[PDB]
From a paper:
Here, using a combination of evolutionary and structural analyses, we show that these protein families are homologous and share a common ancient evolutionary origin that likely predates the last universal common ancestor. This homology is evident in cryo-electron microscopy structures of Vipp1 rings from the cyanobacterium Nostoc punctiforme presented over a range of symmetries. Rings have an inner lumen that is able to bind and deform membranes.
Rungs are maximally constricted at the top and bottom with internal lumen diameters of 14 nm and 15.7 nm, and widest at the ring equator between rungs 3 and 4 with an internal diameter of 17.5 nm. The analysis of different ring symmetries, ranging from C11–C17, provides us with a view of the structural flexibility that enables Vipp1, PspA, and ESCRT-III family members to perform their functions. Furthermore, as each ring comprises between 5–7 rungs stacked together to build a dome-shaped architecture, these asymmetric structures provide us with a glimpse of the structural features that enable filament tilt in the context of an ESCRT-III-like polymer. Consistent with this, Interfaces 1 and 3 linking the top two rungs were poorly resolved in Vipp1C11–C17 rings, indicating a weak interaction once the limiting geometry is reached. When membrane was modeled into the Vipp1C11–C17 structures as a 4-nm bilayer, sequential constriction was observed with the membrane lumen reaching ∼3 nm within Vipp1C11.
Author numbering:
A (entry chain F): 1 to 155
B (entry chain M), F (entry chain T): 156 to 207
C (entry chain S): 208 to 219
D (entry chain BA): 208 to 218
E (entry chain ND): 53 to 104
G (entry chain G): 1 to 52
H (entry chain E): 105 to 155
Write the structure that this text describes.
């Protein structure tokens, strides 16, 4: 029991000393400003990759659409050939591709929503840094005023 | 948004409390200067001066 | 009671 | 699928 | 410190006005939960203000 | 297809459980943010704003 | 808790110290000037190569 | 469903408790400012009294 009490006293004394020593508005703000921007950049990179991925997905989707069109030409060729099997294969392939496209579309919608959510979050995050930047300027302005005020009080 | 112990969040909270207190203290210091008769007289003088 | 008052406020 | 194939055969 | 408390007190008063407006808006909206939150918020602020 | 202990199969199973929990946790964190009155007020405000 | 508190103070001081050492208008501009010039030469060379 | 219903009740209780806990810390936080002001005034008062 005694040890716990002793630890608390030491911790309390240390904590009181620590807060006063590290309480610099300008130093903390500068560090904070650098950190948020860095975090935002990482998010931006992820967003760019996601956008690229969506574009890549669209290209893949386009290829599937292109394949279906090519297959449609093959079906016409099959009629000239007169072979039942070629026509049957094209129809089966066309059906799975449509199903795949639907799945891809659902994935694309989810991806778009995620990107939109990320973009919305980014805008909110961007606004916060702007507010912080404005606040930092205001905070800095106040500090200059305080220095001026103290001298006036002194004289 | 929570304003939690987040390091950036925490620093802002620490900074905000300090500036307000400092500003209030600065105002209090100004008030002490304001308390003196010459300063008090100027305020009365200023209203008349502004009209002129 | 407060909720009841709130409901009254809501109608107009 | 068989029904679809019949339509394809026409061409 | 007195100025800071007054500012905090002023903020609470300002918050109360904003919250009251939201409650009226909530009634128009038809969402019961939003209205309920405002009532709870109003009571604590008044108590805090009285203590302050 | 079995979803058996297959190493690729196993990793996918482990990953799927984690993301859902994380997403739910993220939603829960969002819900906590949503719980605050300012956020709640915005939802009421948003419906009116959308019509405008 | 104490360790976490210490880290914020240390990080802020370290960050402040690092920026302050490099915060020279002439030095920053000179370093910046060298980098763009090197990039410009590379870009110009690349453009020439691209044209070829 | 049975497990969820029991779980939901517990979560709701916790949420209600959390709100009360949040309210309690806020009240405590407000008290420090009041406590700080009287203490500073008290410190100022003793010096004047001694003089």
């Amino acid at each position: 029991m005694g040890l716990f009490d002793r630890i608390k006293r030491v911790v309390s004394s240390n904590l009181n000393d620590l807060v006063n020593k590290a309480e610099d508005p300008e130093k903390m703000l500068e560090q904070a400003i650098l950190e948020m921007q860095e975090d935002l950049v990482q998010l931006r990179q992820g967003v760019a990759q996601a956008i690229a991925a969506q574009k890549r997905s669209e290209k893949q989707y386009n290829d599937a659409q292109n394949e279906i069109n090519k297959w449609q030409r093959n079906a016409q060729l099959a009629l000239q050939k007169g072979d039942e099997n070629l026509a049957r294969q094209a129809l089966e392939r066309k059906k799975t591709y449509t199903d795949t496209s639907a799945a891809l579309k659902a994935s694309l919608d989810t991806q778009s929503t995620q990107v939109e959510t990320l973009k919305r979050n980014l805008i909110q995050l961007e606004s916060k840094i702007s507010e912080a930047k404005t606040k930092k300027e205001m905070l800095k302005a106040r500090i200059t005023t305080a220095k001026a005020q103290e001298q006036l009080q002194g004289m | 948004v929570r304003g939690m112990n987040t390091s950036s969040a925490m620093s802002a909270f620490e900074r905000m409390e300090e500036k307000v207190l400092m500003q209030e203290s600065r105002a209090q210091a100004l008030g002490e200067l304001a308390g003196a008769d010459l300063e008090t007289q100027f305020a009365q003088l200023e209203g008349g001066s502004d009209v002129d | 009671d407060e909720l009841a008052a709130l409901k009254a406020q809501m109608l107009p």
